[PDB]
Amino acid sequence: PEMVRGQVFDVGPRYTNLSYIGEGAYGMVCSAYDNLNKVRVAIKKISPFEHQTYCQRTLREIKILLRFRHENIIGINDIIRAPTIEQMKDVYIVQDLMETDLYKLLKTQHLSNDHICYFLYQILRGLKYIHSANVLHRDLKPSNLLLNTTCDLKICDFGLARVADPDHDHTGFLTEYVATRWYRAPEIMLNSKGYTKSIDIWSVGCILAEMLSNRPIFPGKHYLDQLNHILGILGSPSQEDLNCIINLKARNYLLSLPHKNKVPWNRLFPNADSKALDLLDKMLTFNPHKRIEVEQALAHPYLEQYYDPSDEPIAEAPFKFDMELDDLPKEKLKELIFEETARFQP
């Protein structure tokens, strides 16, 4: 078996000539030559089985990406693992080889307005399909957006994705939350579990801002700091938006803050297209019920050169899990990963 930067890729014989790309807490991504399709691909080695949360993330990714088929969502071409549960220590997810992701890209490249507009269009087009399946991505951020050599963009990961559940969204002040801090909507810190589509729109808003300046717009350094970053730019919420926050601990926290004015988008982004800032304002709206929805956003004048709802497809049916994966043991999740991957056997 080939070995890359310290560990084995049991991906042969179909996939050969591996090259290292990157790694995470419990896996490693390489490129490899697909001997059948005669193209280089990406292979992600995933070793999740020692931990329930790793097993959850892995299963959500596999289950959703296998059901979805959309030009702006990464597909799963193949999955490699051992023929039996006992022998399965890892799973390899094979995908189209992309050139970069938006995180790496923003570290190193200035985007033309044309690129910003095209990237944002593609994010929203992919998100339309996701939301049409009643699915929330819940962790949109630059590193979960892949780009190929011609700047086609594909949303990836889905390890924290859930079925939307607006009737169970309300929670108390400072409720624990998992998704990446800088892309969290203000209501996460106030009264929301992140069970509605508006949570993803906020993240897209943050991504747009970050494309405009190459810097995260709300780089909070801890849970509550995130909210104060948002408020430092948005300013104090209006009386109407406060009256939508019925939980007293959350409302009284906001009431305790000195009056802060809104920082105008054109002072933060003086070189940006004025239509881009108008859409930005609507995505980064404090009140989640007033925040623009994805199909509304696609119809915004900033995107008029791309907008074509007949070319912005939706899912054939809503997505549902067999059961909630929230409280299932890792051994049970391994079973489901095994079953969910059987179709590529062998």
Ligand SMILES: C#CCNC(=O)[C@H]1O[C@@H](n2cnc3c(N)ncnc32)[C@H](O)[C@@H]1O
């Ligand atoms: C685990 C972990 C974190 N590391 C990464 O996932 C390394 O691989 C990326 N990559 C993920 N899919 C990819 C794909 N299909 N084609 C090309 N690069 C890909 C991420 O952009 C990183 O560069």
